[PDB]
Every structure is written in C-alpha cells, then in structure tokens.
Amino acid sequence: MIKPEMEEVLVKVLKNRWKEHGTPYFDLMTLILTDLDSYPVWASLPEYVLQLADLFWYRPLDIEDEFGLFRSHHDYYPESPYQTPIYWL
C-alpha cells in the first residue's frame, strides 16, 4: 500500500550509499535483504532490491575474506534456497 514512499526511501539510500552500521535506514534495509516478511517489496520493486544487494553484499579486496564478503555472513548460516530474496526475484 505504500509503494511510492518505499521507492523514495530506496532511491535516497542508493544515492547516498548508506551501507554501514549507524547510518540512516540501515535496520530496514537489512530486513529487506534477510526476512521473508519483505516479500511484498520483492514483488513490487525488484529492480531496486538487486541494486541494494549489490551495494550491501560485496567488499572489494576465514574464506569469506578471500571471496571479498562481510563477516555478518552468518545471517545465512544454515545454507538453503530460502536464505535470500533470489528465489523470488
């Protein structure tokens, strides 16, 4: 029911690149990348969710450090097709 407002928030986050703990909206963005209740966003605005995942997952140069990934990675620990929005995107 609030697609224009959600889009405005996502545009602002991608413009300012607020990808770090303590910056604005960081908690809600984390949920959009991790939580199944976020599926109306995944259905309504997928082109923005892909850009958000690109911003939040990759860290340019444990084996995570060699792949170039952030150590909050155990949010996905029991690895499964339902851990990420990709199956619905």
Partner 1 sequence: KREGFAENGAKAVYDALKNDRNSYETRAENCAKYTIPSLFPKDSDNASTDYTTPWQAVGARGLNNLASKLMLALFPMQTWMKLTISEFEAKQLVAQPAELAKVEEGLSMVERILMNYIESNSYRVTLFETLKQLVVAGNALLYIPEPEGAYNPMKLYRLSSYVVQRDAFGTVLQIVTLDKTAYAALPEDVRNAMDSGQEHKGDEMIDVYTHIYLDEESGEYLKYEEIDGVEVDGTDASYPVDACPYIPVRMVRIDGESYGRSYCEEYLGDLRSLENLQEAIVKMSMISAKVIGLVNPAGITQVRRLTKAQTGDFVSGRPEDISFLQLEKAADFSVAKAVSEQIEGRLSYAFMLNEEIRYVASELEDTLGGVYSILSQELQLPMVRVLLKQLQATNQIPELPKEAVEPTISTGMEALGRGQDLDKLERCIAAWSALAPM
83 binds partner 1 (CB under 8 A): no
Q: Decide: 85 and 35 in contact? Cβ < 8 Å.
A: no
37 binds partner 1 (CB under 8 A): yes
Q: Decide: 89 and 49 in contact? Cβ < 8 Å.
A: yes
Nearer to partner 1, 4 or 63 (CB): 63
81 binds partner 1 (CB under 8 A): no
Helix (H) or strand (E) holding 4: helix 3-16
Angstrom distance (rounded) from CA 15 to CA 9 = 10
77 binds partner 1 (CB under 8 A): yes
Which residues are at the interface with partner 1 (CB under 8 A)? 21-22, 36-37, 39, 62-63, 71-72, 74, 77, 82
